[model samples]
Target: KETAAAKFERQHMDSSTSAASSSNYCNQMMKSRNLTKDRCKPVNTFVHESLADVQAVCSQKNVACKNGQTNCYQSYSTMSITDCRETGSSKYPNCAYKTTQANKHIIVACEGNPYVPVHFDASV
Candidate 1:
């Protein structure tokens, strides 16, 4: 059984995305990471850093989530990230993704599994 922490790592972490090249990054990762096993994820993010660095996002100033929940936290420090958005032609199994690199703060919703991030909300 995969723990949430482990699942978080597999789904989000990538220590050093050196010279990366791919139009299919999200397609491959979303599938390879199993986020696309049943359905293509609408929007996903990959943190190009360490678990500890990203984990620290929880301690940053809080913000409101899209669901009107105020438990979300936005990272104070700018970080490396990759945003994967589904292409227009993306349909279920075809799961095409448009990947782009970003250096910005992240907004995330956290909970006590105990003290790990639960979901990504947005980037700033």
Candidate 2:
């Protein structure tokens, strides 16, 4: 099975690609990145920073999830990211998304033996 850390990376991280995002970034990425299943993911944020930098957030003193869970973390440095949000009229198999990117601290939830990232919580 893939580790929680790797799974998190696969779903969220894209450090090697520092290219700018076009309006279609979300729709294209959501599908090409395999997030377009029976239903499209409502919203997601992709971090465009090095893996090492993202992992460091796990040990960056920790933070809290919106629900007050304790596994979340906040990165010390701002990062590049693309936020994909589904539009209200979007339909399954014909998913439409709004792509937005910026530099900010990333928040994530972690788990497991080594306690690595599991869920991407937010960006600030």
Candidate 3:
């Protein structure tokens, strides 16, 4: 059996080389956000209106949410972090931070007609 990454690479290579269409078929196999590295790895998408909102969510009863560090923030599009102080005061502060470790990337299997996102974490 082939690994997910290997399968993806094989399909991507086949699609890129085929003469069926000019469009990169493999490109449509996945969706990505906050692509700081290669177009392959994308950051997790988070959204929050204000810093208070972020704090509230982070402080929620959930274990994962509560254990998060102070660097956590929200992202609207792609991947972005908002400072609680900035949102509350409308002024950027030096204490603004974003959760560097909370990042997530998604992969997908595209052998069929429909595509599905496979959750993955590459924060290392």
- Give the Cα lDDT of each candidate: 0.81, 0.85, 0.24
lDDT of 2 by residue, 1-124 (tens): 9777777887898886674368888898888778887789999888888887787788885887988998899888888999989999999999999998888888999887776778999888
lDDT per residue for candidate 3 within 1-124, as digits (tens), equals: 8654343333222222222222222122222211222333222322222333322332222222223433222222221221111112222121211222122211111222222211121111
User: What's model 1's lDDT at 34?
Assistant: 87
The TM-scores, one per candidate, come to 0.86, 0.90, 0.21
Model 2 spans with C-alpha error above 4 angstroms: none
Stretches of candidate 3 above 4 Å error?
Answer: 1-34, 64-124
**Better model by lDDT, 1 or 3?**
1
| Candidate with the greatest TM-score versus the true structure | 2
Error of 2 at 94 (Å): 1.1
Q: What is the lDDT of residue 58 in candidate 3?
A: 25
What clash count goes with each model? 0, 0, 3
